[PDB]
Design a protein around this ligand. Structure first.
Ligand SMILES: Nc1ncnc2c1ncn2[C@@H]1O[C@H](COP(=O)(O)OP(=O)(O)O)[C@@H](O)[C@H]1O
Lengths: 443, 63
């Protein structure tokens, strides 16, 4: 389909026993990281429980230790029930809006308003449309519709006859009509009428007739974020800015009104509030102004849980000239609990490579998996994982059905790991342009 | 002087000719109004003379 194979495609969940929060040694595509997966499952529990507002969790650990994987596992194990916003900290440096406004919109995106509504929908195969069009139009007309179980005829009001002519509704068309709006969606063409569709090309699909009653109440559970309500109220087609962007800085008094109205809908029981998650990937790309805003945004009642990942050690905080752990100011780190991801053992690398060799269509011979595991220890999990794809392409060039050691060796030879790449750089320092701008082009 | 009868201009509600429950549907074939698919099944299975009796109970006739 349109989803290709990607680095996280094998993550199907968090891999944790829902009855106990005990992490299984591997399941759902996660291997090891058990203590970190247990902690993320405790966070996941209190996300679903909703009662706790504006807690922040940092996932801290060396690169490739599964920090994004655990974040993706939580997203896959929340699903559609809960809003889940992913933010790269690079994204808030907008030219359209100040970074605290961009960071406000991200918090607003992570609270859902859940609204349950009904409508009568009429659905069936058109047996006939008669419209007289009697000079003017839409004067009178009759609609006959059937399911497999019923047939009925309807006199149409003139603004429904406009809708029918607008949708060029024809005998044999399978339609749904939302009655209160009066919009007509043509779900398809009935197969029994196929010969009447003389203009439709042979690529055309056909359907069986709808089943049961022509009319029923269908109930829709909408979830709309606070950000969407904010943007809708900004201007006469405010929602249109939810797509193009081109929201300005939305005025604070609009948000304050909406917070009051959503509290009214909750107290009236018309709507429910569904707190989600905001995940801030590589949070150390934020600067000191951002962290000062976050500190108090977290104290709002309508704050999501915020989950964060950092590769950084004791490192320079952006927008200042001093250093702190994770690159995050201590006053912000006081508001945050930290989950640590550790490096992998060789057998866990073997399992992750095996999983990645299942997610791509690759057969690894047992010695090729052993060699990739050895390369994984020596050159890192990500590099060996990229040798899987490379080896399959080399094997296919030699038309082999399984990837052999010869293919992994060609991969290791053709594509350098980060350390050999650095060693190549440290040898070529006269040919590579230095930090001084100096370079020699002679042989 | 027997000129005391009065017509009505308001749109009338639709009731099932069999069960008298409200009727969303008018059957194009037999022209009985009916409540649901269960009653449509009966209506199409009726003895041939019976359909005209359900019409006639509300003063309607097919011809
Ligand atoms: N415990 C694990 N189980 C399964 N796959 C993992 C695990 N840890 C890392 N990976 C995979 O290895 C790759 C690198 O890990 P990643 O989560 O990107 O690390 P980080 O985000 O800390 O750099 C990703 O494709 C990820 O899916």
């Amino acid at each position: 389909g349109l989803n290709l194979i990607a680095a996280h495609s094998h993550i199907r969940g968090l891999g944790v026993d829902a009855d106990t929060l005990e992490p299984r040694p591997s399941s759902q595509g996660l291997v090891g990281q058990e203590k970190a997966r247990k902690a993320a499952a405790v966070v996941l529990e209190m996300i679903k429980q909703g009662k706790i507002a504006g807690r922040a969790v940092l996932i801290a650990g060396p690169p490739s230790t599964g920090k994004t994987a655990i974040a993706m596992g939580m997203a896959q194990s929340l699903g559609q029930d809960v809003p889940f916003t992913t933010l790269a900290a690079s994204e808030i440096f907008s030219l359209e809006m100040s970074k605290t406004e961009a960071l406000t919109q991200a918090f607003r995106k992570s609270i859902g308003v859940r609204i349950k509504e009904e409508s009568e929908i009429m659905e069936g195969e058109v047996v006939e449309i008669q419209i007289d069009r009697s000079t003017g139009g839409a004067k009178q007309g009759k609609l006959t519709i059937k399911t497999t179980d019923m047939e009925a005829i309807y006199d149409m009001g003139s603004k429904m006859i406009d809708a029918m002519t607008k949708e060029r509704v024809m005998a044999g068309d399978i339609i749904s009509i939302d009655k209160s709006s009066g919009k007509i969606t043509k779900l398809g063409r009935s197969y029994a009428r196929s010969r009447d569709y003389d203009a439709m090309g042979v690529d055309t699909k056909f359907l069986q007739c709808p089943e049961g009653e022509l009319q029923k109440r269908k109930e829709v559970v909408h979830t709309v974020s606070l950000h969407e309500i904010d943007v809708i109220n900004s201007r006469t087609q405010g929602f249109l800015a939810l797509f193009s962007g081109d929201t300005g800085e939305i005025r604070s008094e609009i948000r304050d009104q909406i917070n009051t109205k959503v509290a009214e809908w909750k107290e009236e029981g018309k709507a429910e509030i569904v707190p989600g998650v905001l995940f801030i990937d590589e949070v150390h790309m934020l600067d000191i102004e951002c962290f000062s805003y976050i500190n108090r945004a977290l104290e709002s009642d309508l704050a999501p849980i915020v989950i964060m990942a950092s590769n950084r050690g004791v490192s320079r905080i952006r927008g200042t000239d001093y250093k702190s752990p994770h690159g995050l100011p201590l006053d912000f780190l006081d508001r945050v609990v930290i989950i640590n991801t550790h490096p992998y053992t060789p057998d866990e690398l073997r399992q992750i490579l095996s999983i990645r060799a299942q997610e791509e269509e690759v057969d690894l011979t047992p010695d090729a998996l052993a060699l990739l595991t050895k390369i994984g220890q020596e050159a890192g999990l990500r590099y060996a994982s990229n040798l899987i794809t490379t080896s399959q392409l080399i094997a296919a060039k030699r038309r082999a059905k399984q990837v052999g050691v010869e293919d992994v060796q060609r991969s290791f030879k053709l594509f350098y790991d980060p350390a050999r790449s650095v060693r190549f750089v440290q040898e070529s320092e006269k040919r590579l342009i230095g930090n001084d701008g100096v370079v020699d082009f002679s042989y | 002087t027997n000129i005391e009868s009065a017509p009505s201009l308001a749109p009338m509600k639709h009731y099932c000719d069999v069960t008298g429950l409200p009727a969303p549907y008018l059957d194009p074939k037999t022209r009985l109004r009916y409540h649901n698919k269960e009653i449509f099944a009966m209506i199409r299975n009726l003895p041939q003379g019976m359909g005209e009796q359900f019409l006639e109970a509300r003063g309607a006739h097919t011809v």
